[PDB]
Amino acid sequence: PTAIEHMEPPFWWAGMQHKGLQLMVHGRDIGRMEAALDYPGVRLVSPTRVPNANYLFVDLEIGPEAQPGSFDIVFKGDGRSERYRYRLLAREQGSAQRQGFGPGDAIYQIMPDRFANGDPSNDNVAGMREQADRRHGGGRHGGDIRGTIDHLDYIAGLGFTQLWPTPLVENDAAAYSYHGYAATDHYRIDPRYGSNEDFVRLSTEARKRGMGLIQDVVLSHIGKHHWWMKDLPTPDWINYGGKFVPTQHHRVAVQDPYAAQADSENFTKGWFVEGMPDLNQTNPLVANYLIQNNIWWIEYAGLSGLRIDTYGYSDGAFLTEYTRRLMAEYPRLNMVGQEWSTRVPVVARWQRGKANFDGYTSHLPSLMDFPLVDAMRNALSKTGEENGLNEVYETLSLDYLYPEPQNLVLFGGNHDMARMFSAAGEDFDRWRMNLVFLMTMPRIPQFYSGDEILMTSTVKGRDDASYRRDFPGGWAGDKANAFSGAGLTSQQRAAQDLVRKLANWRKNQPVIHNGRLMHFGPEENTWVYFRYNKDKRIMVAMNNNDKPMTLPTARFQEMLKGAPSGVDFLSGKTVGLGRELRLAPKSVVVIELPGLP
Amino acid sequence: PTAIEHMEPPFWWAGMQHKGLQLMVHGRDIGRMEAALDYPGVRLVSPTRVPNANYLFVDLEIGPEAQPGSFDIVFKGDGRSERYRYRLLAREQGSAQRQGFGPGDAIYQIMPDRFANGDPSNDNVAGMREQADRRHGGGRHGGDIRGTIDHLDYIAGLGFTQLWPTPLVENDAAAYSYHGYAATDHYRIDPRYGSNEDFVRLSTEARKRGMGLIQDVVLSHIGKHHWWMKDLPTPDWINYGGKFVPTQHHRVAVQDPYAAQADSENFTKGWFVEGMPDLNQTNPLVANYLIQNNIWWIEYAGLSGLRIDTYGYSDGAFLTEYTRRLMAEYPRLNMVGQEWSTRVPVVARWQRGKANFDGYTSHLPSLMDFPLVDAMRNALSKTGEENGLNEVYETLSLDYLYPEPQNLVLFGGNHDMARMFSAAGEDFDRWRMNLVFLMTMPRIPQFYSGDEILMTSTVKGRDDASYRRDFPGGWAGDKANAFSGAGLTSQQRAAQDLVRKLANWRKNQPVIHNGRLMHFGPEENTWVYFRYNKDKRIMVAMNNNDKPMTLPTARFQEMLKGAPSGVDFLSGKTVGLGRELRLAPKSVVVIELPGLP
Ligand SMILES: OC[C@H]1O[C@H](O[C@H]2[C@H](O)[C@@H](O)[C@@H](O[C@H]3[C@H](O)[C@@H](O)[C@@H](O[C@H]4[C@H](O)[C@@H](O)[C@@H](O[C@H]5[C@H](O)[C@@H](O)[C@@H](O[C@H]6[C@H](O)[C@@H](O)[C@@H](O)O[C@@H]6CO)O[C@@H]5CO)O[C@@H]4CO)O[C@@H]3CO)O[C@@H]2CO)[C@H](O)[C@@H](O)[C@@H]1O
Ligand SMILES: OC[C@H]1O[C@@H]2O[C@H]3[C@H](O)[C@@H](O)[C@@H](O[C@H]4[C@H](O)[C@@H](O)[C@@H](O[C@H]5[C@H](O)[C@@H](O)[C@@H](O[C@H]6[C@H](O)[C@@H](O)[C@@H](O[C@H]7[C@H](O)[C@@H](O)[C@@H](O[C@H]1[C@H](O)[C@H]2O)O[C@@H]7CO)O[C@@H]6CO)O[C@@H]5CO)O[C@@H]4CO)O[C@@H]3CO
Ligand SMILES: [Ca+2]
Ligand SMILES: [Ca+2]
Ligand SMILES: [Ca+2]
Ligand SMILES: [Ca+2]
């Protein structure tokens, strides 16, 4: 290396909650040196040396009296000296109290490579290991930050208030770089997306449009081409001594009274795939690194929260400390973990407030509601079943297992699953039911880019390329363009208009954000539920059958209290409620009524 | 009619835990009368009248100073007087402390009409509404108490230590009387089975052979031919005023934060079927009636516990009081509730010691483990799945939801589901895996009569008659006799030999009764688990594939601790364990090893 090759974090802030700052310094023979500084309020601790000559860890304590400014950190040894001018930034007013995404928000999810190519010139970047190929399902297609910024008006116009892009951090792999989940530099935006500065600008431009930005963070693993892999900072930085030992994905092993240590270790230490070296988070240097890096991104880019990948694949004790550190800095933040299980108890284990049988404590505010998404996809697909909606009702009834079920993220789909429209059997009427459900449940709704124009995919197993097709209109020359409307079918445009109608309506319905829910047991694949408070009732009724259904309204009188009729927000039709509710085949209605006494 | 037509309970005991005793007296204008008695230690409370002149409720407080003996209760009014000689029996020594069935037991379930016809002369009883018809799948076939007693040596010899017959109380219906679930007289054995005394004899004879007797009690409903229905004791005795209003079976409605009262009431008050009037257990007279009746059967017939039908279909507050009362009398008893859900949270809600979100409390010791049975049947039948056993492992990992998972009843099958052998696809090798699992899990195993000779049924849908075919050998003239072994095929006899082998072995295995369990996540439909303590290890390994599989034993070292080999109890063969476990296609081994320090 040349003097100091990497300084991480590269700068920090005065006035953080945790006073300690640990710098990870990288350069040839830097480990052979001693650090010194002189700045009021900043104390240099006592060297803890690592055996690798090319790394030095420097512990600072930044007292509350430290002012924003800069100071040289000088590194002396072997008759030489090296300098780094370290900067402490002033924090933005209100930084610590930043409001995280919550029940009043709706999240729009993109994959940056697959959304919009605003700058074809950065599709390839000289020096990088992969060449772009738009026709390869696993290739880089060239979407970037410029393209995303170009279309913030569209996203906000649809009624979304938060943007979640899959990771933009450097993934300099020879193949499958596009997906972002195998970081090769945690402190750098992949140059094919743009610069670190462009990412900050994406945040500021989103904010001007009333949208927060949620970063997708991977804690458990990196990519095999990470610069660490050439010269391991410590022998135990990577689990299994830096050699590939696969995980077998026994997720319940971390939360099972009958667990073998072999299985729990294999889950948190095993490598996801050979191309994804697993971080040893039981090493305090690794824990500190990840915690500081994510805090750095939040403070630097003005994030509204995080989506945390591969949640339970990280060490359990590390996760307690990581979530504690993050929530201590930003007490109103939201962070949504991805615990990919359709079992309510497995997901609920991780949410802040949960009383666990083993005393495990977490500070994680939110999780992805895979169980409920799975239940609704089953109801919509199992067309041969008399009462598939029962799975949704019974899954919802388990919400008492979560300390804060209204903070969970419910989603129409994402980059890992069959397209929402395909999961509905390409049945527009069933799709409407799914969309109404998403927009009215006591959850934080998240929507996957492309679903608003009924993009389709394969349905069975895992077929990732199928779920990540280029957004129509994201590339110059596209003959179907969802941004302008050009080339959409009437049905695709109707879907898009309905997404806009419901998402913007939801923004202004406090009863959906924090109201009570009363649902009724589904009967013959009809289902009725209500969101309600002193101000408003919203009645949802769906008929998941190809025949009409007539439901006596006596059953629902604890919610209806004699209401003779109402207007369906969707179709705008009046709907009788006096004695019977007549539902057309495959109908869903959404009826606003005044609040109960 | 007859002066006093019913007196219930007909006698009681000195020295019960609960001092109060409420007599329900029935006869023409008995309600017009005034009761009187004189017996030291017994206090007559003073009448609380009901509008029906044909019923009188007499409230007694039997003090701890009351001695065994008998006394007249005299009823006076309208210039007339009636009397009943009331007996307080002395309790058998050790009655209150009786040990309920538990983890060391194995339960053999029969339907008394379908097991053994020891006396063809009671197949029909003069005056009753249904005639026997052995060729009707829903008819009475003639099984009785005599036949069951005749074959107690068989049941004990198979290794079972408890007998659970489906209900024997009078079911005097014109159709479908055989199954027992629609009582027409809670204080009388159906005369087609025998007398009350014969049932007591069944208990005493079973006890001689080391077996307890578990009674199957229905609390929620009765049959429409119950004598009550002719002259309702009170207008609210039966839910919905004695008129048929069906339940829609929304079982989660009683334990759901979002529940409608309509749905909860429909679950606990709705009639199961038109032929099964639903008891209003919110009426304290009905609550007292059922609590006393079940105590009466336990005390009178020397039962080891109860199996409680249609568990959540009874009023929740009633269940709290009923379980408290029963367990206050018999603190060591076991009672297994039938909460038919494959959702672990739904089942776990009811077990004693559970901290429920709504504060619901219960003294119920046990429930039927439908979730784990369903998981194993899926694993063994869906043989095209790569790792179907993963469902069993994950389900078992949720055991922390239950306060006492070791006290749950796990079963091979029962009278309401597809025959065990048929559910395993008539695959004897996979059926062996089910049987080994049943006999080695940290549960109380229950086995269904006929499964030991691989009786078959339909598998699709619900076909009750198909699950309940007569036991071969239970009727004079049967061509095959499973009791003697005559006329069994080699595969039938092999099944029966394996049941006898494993159940008798299990009686002698404290490590299965109360040892720890450590299981490993299944991989490619192979699964390894251990029962262990300082005295013994039992390693179960199953290969749920039609191909050989080899498992490196390094994975299991926390349990194996370098064991080079062990003897498989099934085959008697020594199995190598030093470096790998080599499993043949579709095999299961039960390797016995020394203790784990
Ligand atoms: O040996 C198992 C399996 O391997 C083969 O699949 C290969 C696959 O074809 C290939 O594309 C690659 O997948 C990549 C993927 O494209 C990337 O996106 C990245 O995946 C990350 C993902 O985007 C994240 O959102 C996140 O999702 C994870 C979850 O965290 C996990 O829990 C797990 O979810 C499973 C869930 O737990 C189960 O309940 C069940 O529903 O199945 C889910 C999987 O569908 O995985 C998801 C999705 O990956 O985290 C991911 C990792 O950061 O990285 C992936 C790995 O490179 O991986 C495979 C090998 O190269 C083969 O086709 C299968 O037949 C075989 O069974
Ligand atoms: O004492 C009554 C009954 O109770 C116990 O089992 C109950 C259980 O407690 C209930 O929660 C409920 O569970 C499920 C079923 O498992 C599920 O299959 C479904 O049930 C429907 C059936 O699918 C459908 O065929 C029909 O069932 C009919 C049945 O075909 C008839 O044979 C007849 O069943 C009688 C049984 O033969 C008799 O043993 C007794 O059942 C007991 C059961 O043994 C006991 O362990 O009485 C019944 C009723 O006469 O009639 C029924 C009803 O017409 O309809 C049902 C209901 O839709 O849904 C329920 C609820 O989720 O049922 C089980 C099993 O009966
Ligand atoms: Ca580009
Ligand atoms: Ca890991
Ligand atoms: Ca008989
Ligand atoms: Ca009932």
Query: In three state form, how does the secondary structure of B355-376 look?
Result: CCCCCCCCCECEEECHHHHHHH
Q: Is the CB of A272 under 6 A from ligand 1?
A: yes
What φ, ψ does residue A403 adopt, rounded to 5°? -60, -35
Residue nearest to atom 60 of ligand 1 (CA): A273
Pocket of ligand 2 (CB under 6 A): B 179, 181, 218, 249, 272-273, 309-310, 338, 340, 415-416, 462, 464
To which residue do tokens 């080891």 refer?
B304
Structure tokens that stand for A156 in this block:
């906000």
Number of domains making up chain B: 3
Residues B541 and B585 in one domain: yes
Exposure string of A285-324, with b = 16+ CB inside 10 Å and e = fewer, is bbbbbbbbbbbbbbbbbbbbbbbbbbbbbbbbebbebbbb
| Nearest CA distance, B142 vs chain A (angstrom) | 37
Q: State this model's resolution in angstroms.
A: 1.6
Instruction: Give the C-alpha separation, B98 to A113, whole Å.
Output: 71
Residues B521 and B577 in one domain: yes
Q: How many CB atoms are located within 10 Å of the residue A75 CB?
A: 24
| Nearest CA distance, A261 vs chain B (angstrom) | 8
Task: Select from A264, A386, A520, A531 the residue whose CB has the most chain B CBs within 10 Å, as the one to mutate to test that interface.
Answer: A520
* DSSP code, position B455: -
On whether the CB atoms of residues B271 and A412 are closer than 8 A, the answer is no
What is the SS3 assignment for B248?
Answer: coil
Q: Please name which ligand lies nearest the alpha carbon of A281.
A: 4
Q: Which residues of A touch B (CB under 8 A)?
A: 248, 250, 252-253, 255-263, 343-346, 357-358, 393-394, 396-401, 516-521, 523, 529, 555-559
The response to whether B268 counts as a known ligand-binding position is yes
In one-letter notation, the amino acid at residue A21 is L
Residues in chain B: 597
Closest residue of A to B442, CA-based? Answer: A258
Instruction: Give the C-alpha separation, A431 to A201, whole Å.
Output: 35
Query: Exposed (0-12), middle (13-18) or buried (19+): which is B116, by Cβ within 10 Å?
Result: buried
Query: Exposed (0-12), middle (13-18) or buried (19+): which is B57, by Cβ within 10 Å?
Result: buried
Instruction: Give the C-alpha separation, B530 to B552, whole Å.
Output: 16
* DSSP code, position A118: S
> Regarding beta strands B162-165 and A516-519, do their DSSP bridges make them parallel or antiparallel, or are they unpaired?
unpaired
Q: Strands, E, within A210-265: which ranges?
A: 212-217
Q: How far is the CA of A197 from the centre of ligand 2 (A)?
A: 66
Structure tokens that stand for B475 in this block:
């009727």
On whether the CB atoms of residues A166 and A176 are closer than 8 A, the answer is no
- What's the longest Cα–Cα distance across chain A? 93
Instruction: Give the C-alpha separation, B237 to B57, whole Å.
Output: 14
Instruction: Give how far the C-alpha of residue B261 lies from the chain's centroid of Cα atoms, to the nearest Å.
Output: 30
Q: How far is the CA of B346 from the centre of ligand 4 (A)?
A: 33
Name which of A248, A401, A557 is nearest B345 (Cβ-Cβ): A401
CB pairs under 8 A between A and B: 95
A167 cis-preceded (ω within 30 degrees of 0): no
Structure tokens that stand for B394 in this block:
């994950």
Name which of A258, A358, A559 is nearest B397 (Cβ-Cβ): A258
| Nearest CA distance, A516 vs chain B (angstrom) | 8
- B399 to A258: CB separation less than 8 angstroms, yes or no: yes
- B262 to A397: CB separation less than 8 angstroms, yes or no: no
Q: Is the CB of A310 under 6 A from ligand 1?
A: yes
Residues B220 and B362 in one domain: yes
Instruction: Give the C-alpha separation, B199 to A416, whole Å.
Output: 61
Residues B316 and B293 in one domain: yes
Q: Which residues pair with B589 in a beta bridge?
A: B541
In one-letter notation, the amino acid at residue A320 is T
| Segments forming the whole domain that contains residue B445 | 97-515
What CATH number does the domain containing B447 carry? Answer: 3.20.20.80
In one-letter notation, the amino acid at residue B7 is M
Question: Which of B488, B515, B542 is at the close of a domain?
Answer: B515
Which residues lie closer than 8 Å to A585 by C-beta, 6 or more apart?
A429, A543, A545, A546, A547, A548
Q: Which residues pair with B76 in a beta bridge?
A: B34, B81
What is the SS3 assignment for B42?
Answer: strand
User: Which region, left, alpha or beta, applies to residue B530 given φ > 0 means left and ψ of -120 to 50 means alpha?
Assistant: beta
To which residue do tokens 């037509």 refer?
B5
Residues B488 and B561 in one domain: no
- B258 to A556: CB separation less than 8 angstroms, yes or no: no
Task: Select from B258, B394, B530 the residue whose CB has the most chain A CBs within 10 Å, as the one to mutate to test that interface.
Answer: B258
Structure tokens that stand for A271 in this block:
């490598």
Q: How far is CA B566 from CA B559, B570, B572, B574, in A?
A: 13, 12, 10, 6
On whether the CB atoms of residues A25 and A52 are closer than 8 A, the answer is no
Residues B358 and B498 in one domain: yes
Q: How far is the CA of A191 from the centre of ligand 3 (A)?
A: 10
Task: Select from A248, A339, A374, A397 the residue whose CB has the most chain B CBs within 10 Å, as the one to mutate to test that interface.
Answer: A397
Residues in chain A: 597
CA atoms within 13 A on the CB side of A304: 22
- B521 to A399: CB separation less than 8 angstroms, yes or no: no
Q: Which of A171, A181, A467 to mutate to test the pocket of ligand 1 (most atoms within 8 A of CB)?
A: A181
What CATH number does the domain containing B26 carry? Answer: 2.60.40.10
On whether the CB atoms of residues A417 and A467 are closer than 8 A, the answer is yes
Q: How far is CA A247 from CA A173, A407, B472, B521, B549, in A?
A: 21, 30, 51, 12, 20
Structure tokens that stand for A125 in this block:
């970047």
Q: Is the CB of A416 under 6 A from ligand 1?
A: yes
Q: How far is the CA of A319 from the centre of ligand 1 (A)?
A: 21
Q: How far is the CA of B344 from the centre of ligand 1 (A)?
A: 27
CA atoms within 13 A on the CB side of B470: 25
DSSP states of B384-446 as a string? TSSSTTHHHHHHHHGGGGSS-GGGSEEES--TTS--HHHHTTT-HHHHHHHHHHHHHSSSEEE
- The method recorded for this entry reads X-ray
Judging contacts by C-beta atoms under 8 Å, the chain B residues touching residue A391 are none
Residues A61 and A105 in one domain: no
Query: Exposed (0-12), middle (13-18) or buried (19+): which is B590, by Cβ within 10 Å?
Result: buried
In one-letter notation, the amino acid at residue B503 is A
- A255 to B393: CB separation less than 8 angstroms, yes or no: no
Question: Which of A37, A57, A90 is at the close of a domain?
Answer: A90
What is the SS3 assignment for B590?
Answer: strand
Residues B497 and B524 in one domain: no
In one-letter notation, the amino acid at residue A96 is A
Q: How far is CA A392 from CA A351, A366, A522, B111, B542, in A?
A: 21, 20, 9, 36, 34
DSSP states of B325-357 as a string? HHHHH-TT-EEEE----S-HHHHHTTBTT---T
Q: Which residues pair with B59 in a beta bridge?
A: B22
Question: Which of B72, B90, B108 is at the close of a domain?
Answer: B90
Instruction: Give the C-alpha separation, A445 to A432, whole Å.
Output: 15
| Nearest CA distance, B512 vs chain A (angstrom) | 14
Q: How far is the CA of A142 from the centre of ligand 3 (A)?
A: 4
The continuous run of DSSP H or E covering B261 comes out as: helix B261-269
Instruction: Give the C-alpha separation, A424 to B316, whole Å.
Output: 39
Query: Exposed (0-12), middle (13-18) or buried (19+): which is B554, by Cβ within 10 Å?
Result: exposed
Name which of A345, A358, A558 is nearest B262 (Cβ-Cβ): A558
Residues A528 and A499 in one domain: no
Q: How far is CA B76 from CA A126, B22, B23, B30, B37, in A?
A: 110, 19, 16, 9, 11
In one-letter notation, the amino acid at residue A155 is I
Closest residue of A to B248, CA-based? Answer: A523
On whether the CB atoms of residues A303 and A203 are closer than 8 A, the answer is yes
Residues A73 and A107 in one domain: no
Exposure string of A178-205, with b = 16+ CB inside 10 Å and e = fewer, is bbbbbbbbbbebbbbbbebebbebbbeb
- In 3D space, the residue among B569, B550, B448 whose CA is nearest the CA of residue B512 turns out to be B569
Q: How far is the CA of B340 from the centre of ligand 2 (A)?
A: 10
What is the SS3 assignment for A314?
Answer: coil
Instruction: Give the C-alpha separation, B515 to B535, whole Å.
Output: 9
| Nearest CA distance, A356 vs chain B (angstrom) | 9
Residues B398 and B346 in one domain: yes
What is the SS3 assignment for A397?
Answer: helix
Residue nearest to atom 45 of ligand 1 (CA): A462
- A394 to B521: CB separation less than 8 angstroms, yes or no: no
Instruction: Give the C-alpha separation, A579 to A560, whole Å.
Output: 11
To which residue do tokens 């699964």 refer?
B527
Structure tokens that stand for A429 in this block:
């009427």
Instruction: Give the C-alpha separation, A520 to A530, whole Å.
Output: 9
- A258 to B555: CB separation less than 8 angstroms, yes or no: no
Residues A218 and A345 in one domain: yes
The response to whether B122 counts as a known ligand-binding position is yes
To which residue do tokens 């090296």 refer?
A82
Residue nearest to atom 50 of ligand 1 (CA): A310
On whether the CB atoms of residues A107 and A155 are closer than 8 A, the answer is no
Q: Please name which ligand lies nearest the alpha carbon of A221.
A: 4
What CATH number does the domain containing A526 carry? Answer: 2.60.40.1180
On whether the CB atoms of residues B23 and B72 are closer than 8 A, the answer is no
Write out the residues surrounding ion ligand 6, Cβ under 5 A.
B 220, 268, 278, 313
